[PDB]
Amino acid sequence: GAMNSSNYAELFNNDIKLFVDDTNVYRVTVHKTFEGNVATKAINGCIFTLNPKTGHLFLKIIHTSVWAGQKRLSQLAKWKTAEEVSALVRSLPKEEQPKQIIVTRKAMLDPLEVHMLDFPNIAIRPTELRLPFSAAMSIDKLSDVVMKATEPQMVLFNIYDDWLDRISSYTAFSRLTLLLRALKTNEESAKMILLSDPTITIKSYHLWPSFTDEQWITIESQMRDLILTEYGRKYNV
Amino acid sequence: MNTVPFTSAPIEVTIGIDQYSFNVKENQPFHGIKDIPIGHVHVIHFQHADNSSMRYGYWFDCRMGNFYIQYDPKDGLYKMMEERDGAKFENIVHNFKERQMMVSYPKIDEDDTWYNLTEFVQMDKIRKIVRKDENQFSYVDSSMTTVQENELSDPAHSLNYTVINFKSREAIRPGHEMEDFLDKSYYLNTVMLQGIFKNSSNYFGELQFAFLNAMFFGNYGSSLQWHAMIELICSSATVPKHMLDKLDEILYYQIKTLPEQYSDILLNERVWNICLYSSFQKNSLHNTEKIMENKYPELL
Ligand SMILES: C=CCN(C(=O)NC1CC1)C1CC1
């Protein structure tokens, strides 16, 4: 069924699963027309499909050309997401196909269910968790590849860099979601924390800086403080 | 006019005939129902006084044989049987008439209700939904499940309605996923009308029979099938104009006939709101919309 706090360790068991987030698929800047009306201009988007256990990210880049001449784009975006996830599954070898796909927004359930009718044994699940994957476009290298794309494109990343050599999936997911939650709540301060020290760099083949274990504990603390801080500033507590 | 005689009425029972009903007392001198209009299917149905659970009844057509009711004290219900001996039957009937031991099917002559509820219902189609080919009439009860319900257990006792499933490969063309899910016209017109039902009349007949089973027996499976067949039409952008107009008349008489206090148990809020206010056909059911609004504005 739906996924929540109670069944939280199921993410890191050995049944292949994927999270699908569609919140950056259809992206617009709303602006004014010469006549004083409002128009949208689309920019490139992406489907954020993540294996929470392995860190494998299937970043399908949604080029603005897919929207040309289409109507009801926010609705189309959910079906195009579902079309592209189904195509990914079909492209994978059988032993790599997921047993479950968890959508971060319940509006994807029917589009994905319908596109996956060929896969009756793949469970399509919602979640009660409010996950911060919308903030994926605050990761500079992910944002960079999306904006530069000139055609539809799939790019593969490990969103955990090399963390699984030292920490468990459970801990790697908690770190990822804390980072993303902090980028979502105050992108500027979050990025200042990740880069304040010029001596810690991001490997060419990584997304996040190369923190030692001790430096990560410091970083994580600072990210929590930021999240709590913004909670007071927002709510005045 | 035709007659369904009763051997006797040994247990107290409310007896229905089409949309009429009368109470019969334990061992009251009751010997059946006369003046039944020829040309329509009919349903004769029972709810025992002492156990209202297990409503049952029989679908039949007087042109297909002479039928009577006899109580079975072993299985505990009123059974329909066919009498093959023709002169035995007329003799029984005529004696019971002369003694005036029969109620008269009380059709008001202005009244077209039954015709309008059964317009497209044929016995041949009923007997394909209710499989029991050794009898010319069909038993249906409140507890009988549908083939589709058995998918999601006793197959011989099933209601074999046409399975409709909006998230099924039958409903959805590969490559037209979004198109087909949001506009069911392919599923309605190519899969169901052209492919399965062959014409709208057979489609309407099954819809009408599902409604009647749902209202008369309290059959949950039947209620589900009626709403699905309505929703497949309302959710299609492209429906023949003649089907749309006829649907409006069909539903009108169904809503008109439904008991006022059964709205909570026989009408699906989601379906009717969608069908009347959001679907493609939101503007094509003027009569049904009118009666639903003046008679069931709470549901909406
Ligand atoms: C006598 C039982 C009534 N039914 C029922 O439970 N309906 C529930 C509200 C959906 C079936 C429709 C006939």
Curated annotation (Swiss-Prot), chain A:
Localization, UniProt: Nucleus
Effect of T23A: Reduced growth at 30 degrees Celsius. Strongly reduced growth at 16 degrees Celsius
Impact reported for T104A: Reduced growth at 30 degrees Celsius. Strongly reduced growth at 16 degrees Celsius
Reported impact of D22A: Reduced growth at 30 degrees Celsius. Strongly reduced growth at 16 degrees Celsius. Strongly reduced growth at 35 degrees Celsius
Free-text function comment from the UniProt entry: Functions as a scaffold that mediates the ordered assembly of spliceosomal proteins and snRNAs. Required for association of BRR2 with the spliceosomal U5 snRNP, and the subsequent assembly of the U4/U6-U5 tri-snRNP complex. Functions as a scaffold that positions spliceosomal U2, U5 and U6 snRNAs at splice sites on pre-mRNA substrates, so that splicing can occur. Interacts with both the 5' and the 3' splice site, as well as the branch region. Has a role in branch site-3' splice site selection. Associates with the branch site-3' splice 3'-exon region. Also has a role in cell cycle.
Subunit-level organization: Component of the U4/U6-U5 tri-snRNP complex composed of the U4, U6 and U5 snRNAs and at least PRP3, PRP4, PRP6, PRP8, PRP18, PRP31, PRP38, SNU13, SNU23, SNU66, SNU114, SPP381, SMB1, SMD1, SMD2, SMD3, SMX2, SMX3, LSM2, LSM3, LSM4, LSM5, LSM6, LSM7, LSM8, BRR2 and DIB1.
Other facts: Present with 468 molecules/cell in log phase SD medium.
Protein's UniProt name: Pre-mRNA-splicing factor 8
Full-sequence range covered: 1836 to 2069 of 2413
Curated annotation (Swiss-Prot), chain B:
Predominant localisation class: cytoplasm
Keyword Signal: no
Residues carrying Phosphothreonine: T257
Superkingdom of origin: Eukaryota
Record has Cytoplasm as a keyword: yes
Modified sites of kind Phosphoserine: S236
Localization per Swiss-Prot or TrEMBL: Cytoplasm; Nucleus
Post-translational modification: Phosphorylated on serine and tyrosine residues.
A matching Pfam family: AAR2
Record InterPro entries: AAR2, AAR2_C, AAR2_C_sf, Aar2_N, AAR2_N_sf
GO biological process, one term: spliceosomal snRNP assembly
Keywords attached to this entry: Cytoplasm, mRNA processing, mRNA splicing, Nucleus, Phosphoprotein
Gene3D superfamilies from the UniProt entry: 2.60.34.20, Aar2, C-terminal domain-like
GO CC terms: cytoplasm; U5 snRNP
Region (Leucine-zipper) location: 244-265
Family to which the UniProt record says this protein belongs: Belongs to the AAR2 family.
Biological role stated in the UniProt entry: Component of the U5 snRNP complex that is required for spliceosome assembly and for pre-mRNA splicing. Involved in splicing pre-mRNA of the A1 cistron and other genes that are important for cell growth.
PANTHER family in UniProt: A1 CISTRON SPLICING FACTOR AAR2-RELATED, PROTEIN AAR2 HOMOLOG
Subunit structure as annotated in this protein's UniProt entry: Heterodimer. Interacts with PRP8 (via RNase H homology domain and MPN domain), competing with BRR2 for the same binding site. Component of a U5 snRNP complex that contains at least the U5 snRNA, PRP8, SNU114, AAR2, SMB1, SMD1, SMD2, SMD3, SME1, SMX2 and SMX3, but is not a component of the U4/U6-U5 tri-snRNP complex.
Extra remark: Present with 7330 molecules/cell in log phase SD medium.
Protein name as it appears in the record: A1 cistron-splicing factor AAR2
Gene: AAR2
